[PDB]
Each structure stands twice: as C-alpha cells, then as structure tokens.
RNA sequence: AAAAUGAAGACAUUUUAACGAGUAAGGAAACGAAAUGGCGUAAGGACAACAAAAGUAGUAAAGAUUUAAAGUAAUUUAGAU
RNA sequence: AUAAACAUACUUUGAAUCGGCCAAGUCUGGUAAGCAGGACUGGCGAUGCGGGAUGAACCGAACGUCGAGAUAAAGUGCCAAA
RNA sequence: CGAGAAUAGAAACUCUUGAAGAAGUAAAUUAUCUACCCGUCUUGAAACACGGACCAAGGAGUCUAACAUGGAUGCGAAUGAGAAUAGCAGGAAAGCUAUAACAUGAAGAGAAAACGAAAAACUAUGAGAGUGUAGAAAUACAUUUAGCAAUAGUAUCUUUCAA
C-alpha cells in the first residue's frame, strides 16, 4: 500500500498528550457541583 | 440445571442460615486461562505513570568533530580549552556524559486498551475458578478448614462490624484466619533497587472480601488487617480475582453481594442486566470429562483392545547363527 | 494507610526534613518517656527532654542512671554525667545517647513544664472520654442485632465453625487440567508429601496402640 | 554420505489443539483416542479439523445448514467451526453439532424445535458417526484473498491495497 | 515485548541479519515514494498500475451528505422487526391490519431487491425503491410507501 | 571498471531445484476464443437441457 | 545399585584465543569470523561443543555418589524427598546459617537421607576440640 | 504396615515431627548388604559344571 | 517420520527406522504427544515451613579470591578464606 | 522399463543476492599472458578430512561423539606406517 | 541315516588388588603426533591489506504513527464505543456502568448524470456412512448411499461505451 505519512514536519513539537484528562473530570464535576450549591436553578 | 444449594453462615454465632441460596450461574462459566492472561497482561499496565529523560540531556554542547588527520577518532569533540572537558567526547551514544540510545519519551504508550466483552469474559472465568478448592489452594491459600469454598456470610453479621477487633473475630469464626496469619508471618522486605523508590515491604495475598451496596460501613473495619483486600461486587476485575495472573483467589462473599451476582452477570441463557450486552459463554465441551464417552463406547464394543508393542528381535546372522 | 494528601510518604523527603528542621521542631522530637512513679503523678506519657533532668538508660552497654548535662539538638543526642570515656591522654568526654533509650525519673519543672504537664494531662482525659462515647455507640448497635450477646465476646477465644458442608460443582474434574506445569507439579508433590506423612502417622498410631 | 533428494524436515500438519484452550485440548484428547481405537475415518476427520488454525475453520450459517439438511431429515450436521445465524432466512428443525453457537443462532435453532450439540455429546451418541453429515464452510470468501497476486496481471488481477490517492 | 524481537536472537551475529556484501545502509532507493517513474516504476506498474495520471471531473467542494443513501435488500427487511412479529402476522391478507416496516426510522433510505421475501403481505415505507424491489414486494401481496 | 556482461552458468541448476511447473488440467480446457457458431450451439443445448432439468425440479 | 557413568569428553571447551588475551574470557562463544581457524574446523583446532558430546540420558545430572542433587533450605524441605532417599541427595543452600544447618543435618539422619554439605560451617572444633 | 521406603531410626532426644514415632517403639535393624548366594557344595567325586 | 500408551510418571513418555558438513539468511512467545530447545542481567505482580508465627540472613547477606561438582554449551551448584 | 506416500500440488509472508573465480579430449580477439569474453557440466566462494613435501579450485571423499574391522586416491631404502 | 510330532535330560563359577588410597578426575613437567593473527572488505589474507600496547566500566535495530500478512483471543450481520464526555463506590492517573455520534463491514459498478443483483441454480471430480464375502491378525474385494471444502466450466441477474 502506498504510504501517506505527514511526519516530515517537526511533529515532536506538535504532540499533545492527554495526561490531564483524569483531572478534567474532577475539575469539571467539582465546579459543576459548586454551581449547584451556589444557586441550584442556575445549573439547571 | 439443578444448580446445587449454597449455605450462608452467621459470622458472629457461626450458625448456618436456614434458607440456602442457589449457586449463581456465573460459577459455571468456562475457566479460560488464556483469555485471563490476555486481559491481565493488558490491564496491569494501566497504572503506569509517564516517565522520560530530559529532552536536552546530553545535547547541551556546541561540539564538532575534529575531522581526520589528527590521529583521533571522528566522534564529535567538545570545543574550547582550559578544562578537562574540552577535547573530550560529545553527543555520541557511546561517549561518556552524552545522550544515550533513542531517548525515552514521555509520550510512550503506558495504558493498554481491551475490548469490554473480553474483559467481562475474564472476570467470569476468574469468578468460577474461585469456587474450585483445588485451584484456590494451589494458588497459595490455606482453605483446609473453611466450610464451603464459595464462602458466604450472613448480611446480618456484617452490618454490626464497626471495629477491626470484630472483623478479626468474624474471620476467626469462619476459619479464614489461616490465610491472614500466613500473610502476617511471611511479611518481608523487597530485594533490590525498589527500596530507594519507597517500595520496601513485600506482603503476600490473603482473602478478598466482596461486599454489596449495604456493606459500606464494614469496609473500614477490614482495611487495616494485613493481607485482607475488600472490593465491591460490581468493581471486580482481573487485578483482584487473579493477582499475578494466577487465578483462584480465596473470596469471602457477603449475602448482599452473592445474591446480586445473578443480576450482574446473568446466566448462560439470559443476557446480563448489570453488564448489558454480555452473556456467559458456553464451554467448548458440554461435560468437561472424557471418561463417560470411553465407557459408553466400550459398552458398544467399538474400541479395540489395548496394544502393547511387540519386542522387535535384534538382527542375527543366519549364516553363522544356527538357531 | 495515609489519606492526607498534604503529607508525603516518600522516605527521602522525610529524612531531608529531619536534617533541615529548625530548633523549634527539634525540641519536640527529642522526647522521652516518664517512669512509672512520674506517670502516676502526672498522667502524662512522654514530654520533651530538658537539661538538669534525671534519666535512666534502658538500652545500651551501661544502663546507668544519671543527670542530663547537655541537650545537643544539632546532633539529636543528649549527654549524661555518668556516661563518660577517658580520651587516652587522661581527660574524659561525655558519651552521646539517643533520647529514645532513656526514661525520665526526676523532672526539672520550673514554671513552663508545670503548664505543659497540666495541658498534656487534660488532652489525655479529653481523648479518653471521646473514645468511650464511640465505644458505647458501637456496642449499642451490636445489641440491636444480637440482643442475647455482649461485646466482651470479641476479647475472648473464638470457636471455629467445624461443619464441612461440600458443594458439587462441575469443574472439580477440570481442576488438574487448568494448572500450568510449574503449578501442577507443585500441587501434585504437596499431595504426595501429605499422603506419605499420613501413612507414617497411621503406622505410628498402630504401633502406639500395639 | 548418501545422495538424498531432500533432507528430513518437519511435516507441515498440525497434530494437537492450537493455543491454550483447556476444553479444546480435551476434545483433541478425546478424538485422538477414538480415532486410534475405533479406527474410524470419521474420527480421523474430526480430529484433523480440530487441529486447523482459526482462519481455516470458517463459519457456517443456519441458512447453509438448512439447504444441506433438506434431503436429510433425521440427520446430525457436524461442522467443526462456529455456526452463525442468517437473519434473512428461516431456520427449520434440525440437530447441529458445532464447536460454538452464536447467541442468535442457538436461539433460532432451539426455537424451531431442533438441538444444539457439542462434540462430546456427539462422540457419546455417535462415536464412529452414523447419522451425521460432515459440513465445512467456504474458504475463498475471505476478503484477504482478493489482494493476493499482481494487480497488473492480465488474467486474474489483484485488488490494489488502498492508500495514498487511490482512484 | 522487547524480549521477543529478533534483536535478542541475533546477538553475537556481526551484521544482525542484514548481510555482509550489501550492508544495512541509510537508504534503499529514496525517501518515501521517491523514483515513482524512474527506478521504482516496476513497483508502481506491478502493484498500483493506475497511480499516475488523472481521471474524472473535479468537484471543487463535494457535498458528501447528498450521496448518503443507506440501502437494504428485500430479504433483510423483516429483520428490522424480528422473527417474533413476522410469525405473528404470518396469516394476514388484504383487509386486516398489517405491520409497517419503517426503514427511515432504522436509518435505511433506499430499499433494493435481492433475495427472496417471505410469503406474507407487508407495507414498506422508505425514500427510494428499486424496480425489482417494488416488484418483489408487490408479487408477495404488499404495498410500497414513499417518504420525505 | 569493466565487468562481466552475462553468463548462463548455474542457471539450469536453479531452474530444476523447484522443477518445471507444469500447468494444471484446467489450463488445457479453456474455451475463450473458440469458434463462434460452435459456442452458439453449445450454449443453445446447455440452455435447453437446464430448462428441462429445472422444470422437473419445479414439478417435484 | 549404581550404573556406570560414561563421559564422552572430560575436558573444558575453552574460548578461542582466551589463552593469549586476558580480555577474552574462557566461557565458550562460537567464532563467527569469516576466516576463523576454529570455526572452519582446521586440523589441530577443531574442538567445538556439539550435541553428540551429550552424556547418556539414563545417567545425566547424576553425582558420582549415584544420586541426584536436591537443594533444601529448612527441615520441611527435606520431606519432599523423604520417600526417594535412594534417588535424591540433599544439598543445603549456601546461605543457610549454621544453626539451621544442624537441624537439617540431624533431621536427615532420622529420615535416612544423604547430605552432601554435612561438613559445612562447622565451628572451631578442628584442633584441640 | 510401614511404607516400604520408611525405615525408622532412633533419635537421640533430637526434635522430631509429630508423625515420626518415638524411639521406644522403634527397633533398629542390622544393615544388610549381601544379596547373592555362595557356591553349593556337591559330592567330592562329582565334577563341577565349570 | 510412523506406530503404542497417555491426568501427571519424567529424563520433553515407549519402540522401530532413516538421517546429522555449511558463509549470507531464516526458524518471536504459547500450543501432551507440544509449528526448534534453552542460559544470563535488572525491575513489577504473585508463589516459597500448610497444624494459628509459613523462603534465607549477625550461629554472618550481597560482593571479592580460589577448590571441586553438574551441564555438549551458554552457565549453575557447593566448600574454604 | 525403472524409480516415487515424511510422494505429490502448492498458497501466503519474507530474508540475503545479482563485484565472482577455477578446471576442461571447448570456442572467439590477441604473438602471447596467472590476458579479455562466451556454450555445457562439475567445483571454490560457503569446505573441513586422506594424498600430491608446501597450494581456494587437482585425485579420493564431504564431517554428531567414539570402538573394532575391511577400504579409496596413493604408496612400501631412512625421515615415514607398509 | 533319518525331518515333523509325541515322550524324557542335564547351568550357576574361580583367583588377584584396593582407607597402608582401587577405578576415575584434575594441576605441573616431560615425551610422540598435532597447531600461521584475530575482526573486516574481498574471487581470493597468516599476508609486505587496514584497526588492534594492556585492563576495567560505558557502548550500537529503539519509540511514536499508518497499512498488510500471520499465529493465540472475544463477539459475529455485526464488532468497537477506555470518542469526547457523564455517573458509582473509596479517599483511587487504578476498577465498574452508560441503548450512542461515529469508524470498519453488511452491495456493487460508473468520470458523472442516472442506477443498483436468483433459473429458491446446473455439470465434473471429490470428504463421510452402511451391508456382504474372504483372508483370516490387521486387512483385501463386492455393493448401497451422500455428495461439504477446493478447482474448473455453465446458465441467470446489477453496473459500464466496454466484464
């Protein structure tokens, strides 16, 4: 199969890793809870 | 499916309950070591933390090779003068204080994917092996004294356990303390460079206490006991039921968790409820035994008699051997 | 297991904070235990050590009892007048002792130890009354489920369940065929060894009977 | 030495159960015993087909079983492979022995009044094989076979693995 | 599993399985698909014989949603409602109540005619129909309905 | 840097290690490019015979 | 009863040029040089390990006393060969202390098992004792 | 009866397991080595086969 | 390679027959009659005195120097200092 | 006629390689070459062993570790077994 | 005189050496035979071809991404949904649960417009199952039946200027 791979540019500076993903849940869930406690109609 | 009965014991009084419970259908799933090995090999890597060397480690010099005509190799050399470092080796892989072979990068693959249905296959095969006393003991558990290897305790006794003195008392009543003392007596220290990283103590594995939704207060009691791990019935995985990829963990079920098993995993004919899309598989063989086929074929006079190979005589010389 | 995310379980970080701790936290670390006579008088387990105190060495070559002559917090040691070693040419030098190998037998209590000891005493009592409140609550919930029993059963001997009800499961025939060779051989040898021990035990009992 | 045409090299025939499946290991133990003792060509066939790789044991659908069992009313189809379900066509009453049955195939066969047997029950009931019909699925239907060869060929061109700018 | 690679089995062999006469050098004919018409022409002729050239008209902005048209054959129509419903209405004819197969509700737009339908009346509701699809539905006693 | 041009040395020894692959039987039985009228007659009878075979199947 | 143990080669297969150079150790390595004297099996230097040198299957891994070695770490590990005393011989590991060695030695005498390290880590009772 | 491989020996007050019998009911047996028979003595007149 | 036997023995079964040179190169792991067999380095999860104190260790660990033993070999085991 | 069931037919994936050299009851150019280039086969390369004193190709013959015998090329005054 | 066969008969031993060290094994020396410098390029190196004074430690097919073949694994007209993301217990970079957008596949041909598959198939050889006879131990013939996989060839149908 004819290969079409776009790694000629500096991909090493283009690499984005998702190591913060398990902590986005904790951030968003906690903030989502905090808004509910502030004015529960708002988070509706 | 006759599904033999299972007794439920009182953890405080030691008295069996008057109402037996049918064995859940999850205990008759095929016990596939190869499927468990595939899942455990993938899942055990999911706790790994990213690591990597410095990106600029060993590349922080302006070195260029001296070229030929100087009676030295062509590896790059540090520039300048006045110190011992100048004129020495440079970035090269084999040089001292240079970068190594392909440097480890923090974007490696630390976690491994696995299909969900193959993960549920391995848990059912790991649960079934926990009801085989031969496989439980061969894994390294002392279960010679327990009444039933699918050990269930009353949910009434569990609800009263609030201290580790009571949790230890219950474990003594149901004859499960042999494993707890094996872990206590055999605790030792790690052998190697793992002690500088903080990993010093190396204990063994003991009973696993599987509890339901009504047993959230008894968790705190069992957690300080050495070599006793607790897990909720829904959160079972290969990392609990087969530590070290050796199936047959000694499990202590509670009444609430034992009865929920049928709903969670379903039967061989009913699709599961807790795990939608999954159904217990049928083993390649209906009855995993070879004796009943032989005796029936023997009764039909089909098998030939057992053959013992004749002793082939050694070659002789008829011209010289009269016999 | 630790659950406070602020504190660290790293052995290296613990030692670094031990060496670089200031004088304020060094005093509270060189504590010693009171003796029986002093414990009964004050109801205090341990207090930080002080100069002009009288201690008794309990671990070491010489278990002498003397007076504390130096509390060296930089070296985390203390000095006793009785424990000395002659330095060849004739002069004697004190021998350093870790403060965890001694127990105090006579306090040097001017005015701040008195305030400390009273504060240390009430803290013990306040915790004792709090543990008692929890213990009855645990006992109260145990009676509501087993009204015929009392909580003292947990401190006595335990009688194991001797009933041996077996279960028929259509996998015991496959048990030998579900082990790998390294764990099959060990399992079979354990069976062979166990049988031979039972054979000798049986023969011995027959000889004992006869 | 001796002028041989070629030296002795391992024969390229499997003789045991591939993998670490404990149940499939016992099936080969059972039919290796039956074929050796009964000396029946049926057991030698089932033993051989149990030792093929997964790719060489293609599936058979309920539609294909129905067509092959049309003129064999009281018979037992025997296919050493997974039996899937063809939802397009109805499933009549028949007895099938196979290594594994799809959840939908097992329901369809049972609901029609038939039976789903495993190979130990077949050996217990028909060891030498008396009212059975040997069936195997098609092999050339694999899509991998399309790309084999040279796609520039004049006679039977291949299928040109797709890639960069394929028209 | 780095312990199962061929590198661990070739330790002690000088060239690591790459040859002595022809070494393992940096390149073997260019980087990427280089030389597609000079020295790798026999590769492109042999294995991608239509790689170079042009064909067809350019679509400056292709609206790929206008070509979306999932298809289902006639024999597969009854699988949308299952065999349980199919047997229930097996003995119906004109005049009484007949199940309706909503292909659009299941994501199927065009109904093609391939295979054989069960000999029961049925109402097929869809967006497009093949000529042979409508013939096979009508030849069995059914009706075809348009949508959208 | 003159080099040797060509040699048939060792070529026959190579061609006989895996000997001359004869064609299969189906190679000789191909019918593409046969006589036009002959193919028409053969097709006519194969259509006639198939229809007769099929109506008996439909009859039973 | 003891069979006759026959060894086809009692010497050692030393590495090539291990005698001339101290950086080359004596552990065997197959010479892969294109012009190597030993690999080409010249006269004089044609001594390589080959499977034909293997000893008889019956008497393989058998000590000269006629028994097979069995390592033991405590008295309980002796019971695993307590029924095969005519085939196996005990072997106390190199790290077992002198105190635990006495228990193993005195227990094996009870079970009638041969021990090969029976004179290991003995105290100073050699002269005037 | 004792297993064929079990030949009990006396323990000089050394620690013994539970299963191993006490020496009071353990009787020593003299070690036996010879297993072949000597040559038979025939008549003075008759000659040996050898 | 072919016969026989086969839930565990064991030496990777038993018997018979043919065979064994080799640069470049190949033969990943698993697969009871095993679709090559193994040695070594370091780390992670388990197992290691089955009767409630369960691998070794101040009655001397790792390491170093040698003497012997096992293995065709990679190497392993043990004694002495 | 003779041989052929570890026969036969293969399918897929892939390694290395396309600097060659020698012999001759062979050929072409050249005065000729241990020169240059070819047809057929066997070899060396990749190959050790016995003989030709010594030798990549010559003659016998191809190799798991050994014991006993009959041999091959070729030898039998001494080196050197006869 | 005598094969077969029937009937009766017969084999258990000596000497020497060895804890005053047997047999074997190892080390050093001697003696006969034997042995050119390793790695590499090369048709060919022990080469008057190149690197190598000696020792220790370090030292070179790895990681990410796309495709294909192949062996083990789950499910199967579906598979995946550890797509983001949202919840659960426990405090958790781990574990469990989410009727779900989509990815690949189930339909193919055409540049595109426009379309979109049965004569409920045929022929040949082929896996398997019986019954009888006989040798006679296994096995060798006769005969009834079925004809899967695979290969090849046919009709028929979709698309294409063109199969």
From Swiss-Prot, chain E:
GO MF term set: structural constituent of ribosome
Superkingdom of origin organism: Eukaryota
One CC-aspect GO term: cytosolic large ribosomal subunit
One of the GO BP terms on file: translation
Positions of region (Disordered): 20-39
Keywords assigned by UniProt, alphabetized: Cytoplasm, Endoplasmic reticulum, Ribonucleoprotein, Ribosomal protein
InterPro entries referenced in this protein's UniProt entry, alphabetically: Ribosomal_uL15 (IPR030878), Ribosomal_uL15/eL18 (IPR021131), Ribosomal_uL15/eL18_sf (IPR036227), Ribosomal_uL15_CS (IPR001196)
Location(s) in or outside the cell: Cytoplasm, Cytosol; Cytoplasm; Endoplasmic reticulum
Subunit structure, interactors included: Component of the large ribosomal subunit.
General function of this protein: Component of the large ribosomal subunit. The ribosome is a large ribonucleoprotein complex responsible for the synthesis of proteins in the cell.
Similarity comment: Belongs to the universal ribosomal protein uL15 family.
Protein name according to UniProt: Large ribosomal subunit protein uL15A
Native source species: Entamoeba histolytica (strain ATCC 30459 / HM-1:IMSS / ABRM)
């Amino acid at each position: 199969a004819v290969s079409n791979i776009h790694f000629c540019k500096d991909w090493r500076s283009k690499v984005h890793t998702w190591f913060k993903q398990p902590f986005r849940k904790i951030r968003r869930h906690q903030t989502r809870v905090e808004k509910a406690k502030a004015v529960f109609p708002a988070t509706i | 499916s006759l599904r033999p009965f299972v007794t439920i014991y009182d953890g405080i009084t030691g008295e069996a309950e008057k109402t037996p419970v049918r064995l859940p259908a999850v205990f008759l799933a095929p016990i596939r070591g190869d499927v468990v090995h595939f899942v455990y090999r993938n899942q055990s890597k999911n706790t790994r933390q990213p690591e990597g060397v410095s990106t600029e480690a060993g590349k922080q010099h302006s070195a260029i090779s001296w070229g030929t005509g100087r009676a030295v190799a062509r590896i790059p050399r540090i520039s300048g003068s006045g110190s011992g470092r100048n004129g020495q080796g440079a970035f090269g892989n084999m040089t001292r204080k240079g970068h190594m072979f392909s440097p480890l990068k923090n974007f490696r693959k630390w976690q491994r994917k696995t299909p969900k249905q193959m993960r549920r296959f391995a848990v059912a095969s790991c649960i079934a092996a926990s009801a085989v006393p031969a496989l439980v003991s061969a894994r390294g558990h002392h279960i010679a004294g327990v009444p039933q290897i699918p050990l269930v305790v009353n949910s009434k006794s569990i609800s009263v356990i609030k201290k580790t003195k009571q949790a230890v008392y219950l474990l003594k009543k149901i004859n499960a303390y042999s494993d707890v003392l094996k872990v206590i007596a055999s605790k030792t220290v790690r052998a190697g460079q793992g002690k500088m990283r903080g990993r010093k103590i190396k204990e063994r594995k003991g009973p696993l206490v599987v509890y339901g939704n009504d047993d959230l207060q008894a968790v705190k009691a069992f957690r300080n006991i050495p070599g006793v791990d607790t897990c909720r019935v829904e959160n079972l995985s290969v990392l609990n039921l087969a530590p070290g990829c050796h199936m047959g963990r000694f499990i202590i079920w509670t009444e609430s968790a034992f009865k929920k098993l049928n709903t969670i995993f379903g039967t061989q004919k009913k699709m599961a409820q807790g795990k939608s899309g999954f159904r217990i598989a049928h083993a390649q063989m209906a009855v995993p035994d070879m004796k009943r086929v032989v005796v029936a074929a023997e009764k039909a006079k089909l098998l030939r008699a057992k053959i013992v190979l004749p002793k082939v005589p050694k070659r002789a010389n008829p011209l010289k051997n009269w016999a | 297991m630790k659950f406070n995310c602020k504190v660290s379980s790293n052995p290296s970080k613990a030692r670094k904070a031990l060496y670089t701790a200031n004088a304020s936290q060094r005093a509270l670390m060189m504590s010693a235990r009171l003796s029986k006579e002093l414990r009964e008088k004050y109801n205090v387990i341990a207090i930080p050590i002080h100069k002009d105190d009288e201690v008794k060495i309990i671990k070491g070559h010489q278990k002498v009892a003397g007076k504390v002559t130096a509390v060296r917090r930089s070296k985390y040691v203390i000095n006793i007048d009785k424990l000395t070693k002659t330095k060849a040419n004739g002069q004697t030098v004190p021998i350093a002792i870790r403060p965890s190998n001694v127990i105090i037998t006579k306090l040097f209590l001017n005015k701040d130890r008195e305030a400390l000891l009273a504060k240390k005493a009430e803290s013990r009592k306040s915790y004792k009354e709090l543990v008692a409140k929890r213990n009855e609550e645990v006992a109260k919930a145990f009676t509501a489920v087993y009204p015929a029993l009392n909580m003292d059963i947990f401190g006595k001997k335990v009688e194991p369940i001797t009933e041996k009800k077996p279960i028929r499961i259509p996998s015991k025939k496959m048990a030998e065929k579900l082990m790998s060779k390294p764990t099959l051989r060990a399992y079979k040898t354990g069976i062979k060894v166990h049988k031979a021990k039972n054979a000798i035990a049986a023969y011995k009992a027959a000889l004992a009977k006869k | 030495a001796i002028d041989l045409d070629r030296h002795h090299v391992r024969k390229h025939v499997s003789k045991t159960a591939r993998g670490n499946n404990a149940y499939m290991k016992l099936l080969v133990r059972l039919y290796g015993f039956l074929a050796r003792r009964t000396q029946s060509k049926f057991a030698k066939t089932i033993l051989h087909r149990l030792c093929l790789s997964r790719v060489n044991r293609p599936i058979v659908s309920t539609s294909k079983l129905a067509c092959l069992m049309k003129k064999h009313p009281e018979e037992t189809a025997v296919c050493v492979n997974t039996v899937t379900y063809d939802s397009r066509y109805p499933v009549p009453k028949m007895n099938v022995c196979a290594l594994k049955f799809t959840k939908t195939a097992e329901a369809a066969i049972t609901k029609a009044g038939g039976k789903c047997l495993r190979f130990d029950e077949l050996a217990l009931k028909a060891p030498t094989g008396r009212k059975t019909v040997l069936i195997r699925g098609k092999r050339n239907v694999r899509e991998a076979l399309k790309h084999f060869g040279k796609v520039c060929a004049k006679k039977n061109p291949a299928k040109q693995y797709k890639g960069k700018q394929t028209k | 599993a780095t312990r199962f690679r061929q590198t661990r089995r070739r330790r002690g062999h000088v060239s690591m399985g790459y040859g002595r006469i022809g070494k393992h050098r940096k390149q073997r004919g260019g980087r990427g698909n280089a030389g597609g018409q000079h020295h790798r022409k026999t590769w492109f002729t042999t294995f991608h014989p239509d790689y170079f050239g042009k064909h067809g008209m350019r679509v400056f902005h292709l609206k790929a949603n206008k070509y979306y048209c999932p298809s289902i054959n006639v024999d597969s129509l009854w699988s949308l409602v299952g065999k349980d419903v199919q047997a229930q209405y097996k003995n119906a004819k004109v005049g009484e109540e007949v199940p309706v197969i909503d292909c659009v509700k299941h994501g199927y737009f065009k109904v093609l005619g391939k295979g054989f339908l069960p000999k029961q009346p049925v109402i097929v509701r869809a967006r497009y129909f093949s000529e042979k699809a409508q013939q096979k539905i009508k030849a069995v006693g059914g009706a075809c309905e348009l949508t959208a | 840097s003159k080099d040797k041009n060509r040699s048939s040395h060792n070529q026959s020894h190579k061609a006989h290690r895996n000997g001359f692959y004869k064609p299969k039987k189906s190679a000789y039985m191909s019918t593409k490019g046969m006589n036009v009228q002959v193919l028409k007659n053969t097709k006519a009878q194969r259509k006639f015979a198939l229809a007769k075979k099929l109506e008996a199947k439909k009859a039973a | 009863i003891k069979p006759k143990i026959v060894k086809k080669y009692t010497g050692h297969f030393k590495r090539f040029d291990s005698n001339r150079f101290l950086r080359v150790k004596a552990s065997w390595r197959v010479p892969r040089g294109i012009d190597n004297r030993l690999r080409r099996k010249f006269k004089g230097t044609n001594l390589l390990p080959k499977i034909g040198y293997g000893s008889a299957k019956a008497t393989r891994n058998m000590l000269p006393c006629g028994l097979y070695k069995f390592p033991v770490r405590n008295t309980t590990d002796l019971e695993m060969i307590m029924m095969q005393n005519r085939k196996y011989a005990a072997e106390i590991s190199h790290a077992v202390s002198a105190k635990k060695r006495q228990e193993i030695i005195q227990r094996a005498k009870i079970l009638n098992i041969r021990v090969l390290n029976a004179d290991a880590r003995i105290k100073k009772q050699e002269v005037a004792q | 009866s004792a297993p064929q491989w079990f030949v009990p020996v006396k323990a000089g007050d050394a620690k013994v397991p539970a299963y191993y019998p006490t020496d009071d009911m353990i009787q020593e047996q003299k070690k036996k080595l010879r297993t072949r028979k000597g040559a038979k003595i025939t008549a003075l007149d008759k000659p040996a086969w050898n």
